[PDB]
Design an enzyme around this catalytic site. Structure first.
Site, mmCIF file in Angstrom:
data_model
loop_
_atom_site.group_PDB
_atom_site.id
_atom_site.type_symbol
_atom_site.label_atom_id
_atom_site.label_comp_id
_atom_site.label_asym_id
_atom_site.label_seq_id
_atom_site.Cartn_x
_atom_site.Cartn_y
_atom_site.Cartn_z
ATOM 1 N N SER A 166 -7.852 -2.165 -6.478
ATOM 2 C CA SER A 166 -8.554 -0.894 -6.665
ATOM 3 C C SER A 166 -9.154 -0.753 -8.065
ATOM 4 C CB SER A 166 -7.622 0.287 -6.373
ATOM 5 O OG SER A 166 -6.591 0.378 -7.339
ATOM 6 N N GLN A 184 -0.065 2.410 -6.925
ATOM 7 C CA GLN A 184 -1.489 2.550 -7.265
ATOM 8 C C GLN A 184 -1.775 2.136 -8.708
ATOM 9 O OE1 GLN A 184 -3.795 6.072 -6.032
ATOM 10 N NE2 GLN A 184 -2.104 6.623 -4.657
ATOM 11 N N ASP A 232 -2.013 -1.636 -8.824
ATOM 12 C CA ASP A 232 -2.944 -2.235 -7.863
ATOM 13 C C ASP A 232 -4.185 -2.813 -8.548
ATOM 14 O OD1 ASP A 232 -4.342 -3.001 -5.592
ATOM 15 O OD2 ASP A 232 -4.808 -0.966 -4.937
ATOM 16 N N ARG A 244 0.826 -1.202 0.000
ATOM 17 C CA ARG A 244 0.000 0.000 0.000
ATOM 18 C C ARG A 244 0.864 1.257 0.000
ATOM 19 N NH1 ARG A 244 -4.933 -1.106 -1.809
ATOM 20 N NH2 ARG A 244 -5.483 0.948 -0.934
ATOM 21 N N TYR A 259 -6.748 0.818 5.927
ATOM 22 C CA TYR A 259 -7.830 -0.152 6.120
ATOM 23 C C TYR A 259 -8.531 0.042 7.460
ATOM 24 C CZ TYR A 259 -5.899 -2.698 2.130
ATOM 25 O OH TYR A 259 -5.474 -3.058 0.873
HETATM 26 N N1 APR Z 1 -17.922 -2.193 10.326
HETATM 27 C C1 APR Z 1 -17.722 -1.345 9.289
HETATM 28 N N2 APR Z 1 -18.575 -0.320 9.049
HETATM 29 C C2 APR Z 1 -18.407 0.542 8.024
HETATM 30 N N3 APR Z 1 -17.376 0.444 7.161
HETATM 31 C C3 APR Z 1 -16.472 -0.552 7.309
HETATM 32 C C4 APR Z 1 -16.574 -1.511 8.371
HETATM 33 N N4 APR Z 1 -15.517 -2.399 8.255
HETATM 34 C C5 APR Z 1 -14.828 -1.944 7.140
HETATM 35 N N5 APR Z 1 -15.403 -0.833 6.586
HETATM 36 C C6 APR Z 1 -15.089 0.004 5.400
HETATM 37 O O1 APR Z 1 -15.244 -0.805 4.235
HETATM 38 C C7 APR Z 1 -14.285 -0.346 3.289
HETATM 39 C C8 APR Z 1 -14.239 -0.911 1.842
HETATM 40 O O2 APR Z 1 -13.468 -2.126 1.845
HETATM 41 P P1 APR Z 1 -11.886 -2.213 1.507
HETATM 42 O O3 APR Z 1 -11.685 -2.995 0.134
HETATM 43 O O4 APR Z 1 -11.098 -2.946 2.680
HETATM 44 O O5 APR Z 1 -11.369 -0.692 1.385
HETATM 45 P P2 APR Z 1 -10.498 -0.200 0.123
HETATM 46 O O6 APR Z 1 -11.379 -0.223 -1.197
HETATM 47 O O7 APR Z 1 -9.195 -1.091 -0.063
HETATM 48 O O8 APR Z 1 -10.098 1.311 0.505
HETATM 49 C C9 APR Z 1 -9.075 1.583 1.464
HETATM 50 C C10 APR Z 1 -8.288 2.835 1.070
HETATM 51 O O9 APR Z 1 -8.565 3.199 -0.288
HETATM 52 C C11 APR Z 1 -8.972 4.566 -0.407
HETATM 53 O O10 APR Z 1 -10.242 4.646 -1.041
HETATM 54 C C12 APR Z 1 -9.045 5.153 0.996
HETATM 55 O O11 APR Z 1 -8.209 6.297 1.114
HETATM 56 C C13 APR Z 1 -8.615 4.045 1.942
HETATM 57 O O12 APR Z 1 -7.485 4.433 2.711
HETATM 58 C C14 APR Z 1 -13.255 0.572 3.913
HETATM 59 O O13 APR Z 1 -13.403 1.879 3.389
HETATM 60 C C15 APR Z 1 -13.639 0.497 5.382
HETATM 61 O O14 APR Z 1 -13.478 1.742 6.036
#
Ligand code: APR
Ligand code: NDP
Ligand code: APR
Lengths: 359, 174, 378
Positions: free
Chosen positions: C138, C132, C135, C127, C235
């Site tokens: 994403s 990016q 990745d 990360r 995350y």
């Molecule tokens: N209990 C919960 N309630 C609400 N949201 C949750 C919970 N558990 C996890 N999440 C949210 O679900 C999300 C979407 O899933 P991921 O694939 O893990 O996140 P990701 O798409 O990898 O995004 C993480 C990164 O990317 C950028 O958009 C952003 O800056 C962030 O740092 C995250 O944004 C996370 O905050």
């Protein structure tokens, strides 16, 4: 005075000719509103929702219609020739308001006439400003135009909008709308707001300005301007065809030779499929793949938006009926000098009355 | 017999208003003037003026014609109103800013029984202190009839393209 | 130096790890690009277009991989145990780059190790900002966010936008996106495009501003507890049962008015958090739709079932598998570009060879095995 709304029994019909809002207006007018149980489930209208607005729930279609002076439904009632005699359920002397398809379905008009039922075919509503609120052709086809785009986007394997990303850019979807009536205009608007580049064509001249008023481009330049249409069609990802002419087969706008020249992954939504289609490869109720092109031909597209289509249909019915209710004596008297009554009435008191149907 | 007007004249009238009701129509869509329209609303709202939009059920040439274009220009839903919930507010309105509408405002709909638009409910823009019509010419709308409001004493015609006029109206304001 | 790309054989996989554009770039780096016949059909990428870009077409999967000293795939190779041994088709010593799922699929890792194949797991991309462009998580989830709204609209029996009409006003649809990561931001944007009123929530505080800039309204739950929600890689973490009740209550007000609920919440190395219980769907309107994008990870809604549309309590709960493959023709060129960006910096130009720099943390974090030895701690 009782009004009744049964469940739609024709295969795939999920609309209903009622809503909770319209039930309130009908009881306020002096009606006992009765509706068959489960009639609104396809339109996300529960029996509990109807009862709360003042309606009574009948357990069967026969019971719902037994004593009803007015009957509302969306599609024409089934006859004994179709295996289910729904007109027999309607009381003698009663009034029926629905999408009757009267000019292409004389047998249902005949059968209603035998029971001395006065039937008003809503599709024959006169095209005057006063009656835009009563117009089921407009309300239902508008949602079909929206739906066509949702169905196109579902079947298509790329996203509609342009997206500039860290990994690279993917271009917008290119949409070509054939026929720029009510459905065509909403398809253009729905396609454009999703981020697609949108072209359109139509025979009527005033329609070019209408296309441009939604941010679409009209296909413009002895009769061979089909060259200009083809040039865009070869670049098109989703083609939506909406061209019909009532009582006649739909005009062929995309031939089989034209689909062979389209790119693979392309889709055609043929909204004119029930009238023979604007594309001859389309088949009612099916998605066929030919020459790498999905040709989508769903029937009853308004029913694919049944939950928004039903409130609008019932309001069209209400706007048509309301002027003729005189509470002074709890009855409906349909004024004959009213153009909306004369243009739409097909049979009355045991005789056919519409000029197009009389022997 | 029509009291014509210009961008400068129209800009004084709205800036000195406690309340302005915008009445969009087909001509607004033809000109694609919604971005510059919502621009004018931002400047009006910044002065402390109350802004709303009056949407006739059959404005434009399709259902929701005004809605999609207003949504594209990012005007919030809370400012947009349907005929039946906004018609009484025209009494309290200093100005009705009619942009590309015509048939939708025409009072012959309830006066003249022989009119093509008779019986169609309309937006009661005449109840406002002043009415501002934006359209290119004195040409009729879809129905093909004249509008009494055009040559009314309290009406002002802004003859030109709806996008260009509104853009110019925004300039006269600050 | 040959690079090969076979067709994806796993059920329902329509993506492909190549595009005409990417072929051109690979030829310029000094590769003979060999694509399996018909591999781009699902992504609308023809053999002719691949050929015009400078690729050779091979008749079978074995024939494409036979002389290939580097292989690009979307999903991991199927093993003999799974039905067809694709690992066996890959030449010994070659390098494999794909969405490998190495952490939860040890069998495929050892099979590749047994054939001395150097395997690079793209989901383990570190990360960092400069990665990016490489990745795959994403790029694919962004399109899954779009697709969730299209799937929601398709299953929904109402229209998204507000329309004032002669027959009356059709109200806008109300959309609620749970989790505003990459997929959730695109869901908000796409729902907004269609005219929906969009609500959203997330545990990470930084997300409130992102939602608001897209024209959505954020559902605040615990201002203090949301501050320490992010981690080193951006995350979320396991919030606990106490916060789950706090969240469910604040969400209830809008969820009973919600037409489409899109759930995208993920927690690394863990089951997906429950955001909409069976009790909460009892309170939703009939005809409402839930799109559970976290279904393959357990689901944000326990009524979700992978590969099925479940109907219960008058509510459609949709749990399509492999949502990116439902946008295969956009997903494929972007996946192909992720791989190109990962591979390009390590191509030693004037030796027509591939020297994957070991000091590069992009290379170290991704590599699972090399030369018959499992290298990455797992
Ligand atoms: N209990 C919960 N309630 C609400 N949201 C949750 C919970 N558990 C996890 N999440 C949210 O679900 C999300 C979407 O899933 P991921 O694939 O893990 O996140 P990701 O798409 O990898 O995004 C993480 C990164 O990317 C950028 O958009 C952003 O800056 C962030 O740092 C995250 O944004 C996370 O905050
Ligand atoms: N909404 C719907 O689904 C349907 C609507 N209709 C009908 O259409 C009418 C719609 O009413 P309304 O919205 O008032 O539209 P109107 O047609 O009544 O008026 C539009 C006005 O906009 C002006 N105009 C056109 N282009 C421009 C431009 N580029 N710049 C500035 N002005 C312009 C015209 O005047 P000028 O040329 O002088 O500029 C015209 O007077 C109703 O009568 C309705 O019944 C019909 C079918 C469908
Ligand atoms: N060969 C053809 N090629 C292209 N277009 C055709 C062809 N044949 C018919 N059409 C077009 O198909 C159309 C769409 O189908 P309809 O159901 O007939 O549209 P409809 O809503 O009944 O009529 C348009 C109505 O709506 C308003 O926009 C407008 O004021 C008009 O009264 C019409 O616009 C018509 O011009």
């Amino acid at each position: 005075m009782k009004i009744a709304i049964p469940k739609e029994r024709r295969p795939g019909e999920d609309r209903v000719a009622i809503s909770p809002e319209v039930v309130k207006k009908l009881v306020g007018l002096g009606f006992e509103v009765i509706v068959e149980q489960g009639a609104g489930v396809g339109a996300s209208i529960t029996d509990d929702a109807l009862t709360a607005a003042g309606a009574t729930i009948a357990s069967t279609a026969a019971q719902a219609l037994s004593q009803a002076d007015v009957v509302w439904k969306v599609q024409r009632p089934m006859t004994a020739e179709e295996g289910t005699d729904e007109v027999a359920l309607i009381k003698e002397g009663a009034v029926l308001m629905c999408h009757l398809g009267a000019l292409t379905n004389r047998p249902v008009v005949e059968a209603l006439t035998k029971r001395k039922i006065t039937a008003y075919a809503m599709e024959l509503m006169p095209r005057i400003s006063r009656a835009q609120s009563m117009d089921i052709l407009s309300s239902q086809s508008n949602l079909a135009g929206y739906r066509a785009v949702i169905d196109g986007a579902y079947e298509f394997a790329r996203a509609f909008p342009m997206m500039m990303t860290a990994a690279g850019t993917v271009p917008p979807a290119r949409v070509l709308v054939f026929g720029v009536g009510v459905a065509g205009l909403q398809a253009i608007a729905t396609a454009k707001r999703l981020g697609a580049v949108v072209m359109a064509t139509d025979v009527r001249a005033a329609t070019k300005e209408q296309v441009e008023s939604l941010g679409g481009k009209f296909i413009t330049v002895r009769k061979k301007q089909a060259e200009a249409v083809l040039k865009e069609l070869v670049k098109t990802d989703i083609a939506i065809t909406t061209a019909l002419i009532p009582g006649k087969p739909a005009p062929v706008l995309i031939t089989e030779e034209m689909v062979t020249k389209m790119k693979p992954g392309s889709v055609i939504i043929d909204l004119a499929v029930e009238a023979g289609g604007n594309c001859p490869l389309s088949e009612p109720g099916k998605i066929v793949v030919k020459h790498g092109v999905k040709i989508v031909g769903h029937t009853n597209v308004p029913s694919r938006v049944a939950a928004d289509a039903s409130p609008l249909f019932a309001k069209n019915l209400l706007n048509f009926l309301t002027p003729h209710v005189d509470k002074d004596t709890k009855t409906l008297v349909m004024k004959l000098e009213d153009e909306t009554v004369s243009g739409t009435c097909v049979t009355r008191d045991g005789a056919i009355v519409h000029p197009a149907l009389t022997g | 017999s029509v009291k014509a007007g210009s961008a400068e004249d129209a800009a004084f009238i709205m800036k000195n208003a406690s309340k302005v009701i915008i009445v969009p129509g087909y001509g607004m869509a033809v000109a694609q003037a919604q971005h510059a329209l919502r621009e004018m609303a931002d400047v009006l709202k910044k002065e402390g003026v109350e802004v709303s939009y009056a949407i006739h059920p059959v404005a434009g040439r399709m259902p929701g014609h005004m809605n999609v274009l207003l949504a594209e220009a990012n005007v919030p839903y809370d400012e947009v109103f349907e005929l039946e919930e906004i018609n009484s507010s025209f009494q309290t309105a200093d100005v009705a800013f009619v942009i590309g509408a015509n048939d939708v405002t025409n009072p012959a709909a309830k006066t003249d029984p022989s009119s093509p638009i008779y019986g169609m409910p309309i937006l009661d823009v005449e109840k406002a202190g002043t009415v501002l019509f934006i359209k290119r010419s004195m040409a009729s709308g879809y129905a093909g009839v004249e509008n009494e409001l055009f040559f009314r004493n309290n009406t002002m015609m802004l003859f030109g393209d709806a996008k260009k006029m509104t853009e110019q109206i925004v300039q006269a304001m600050n």
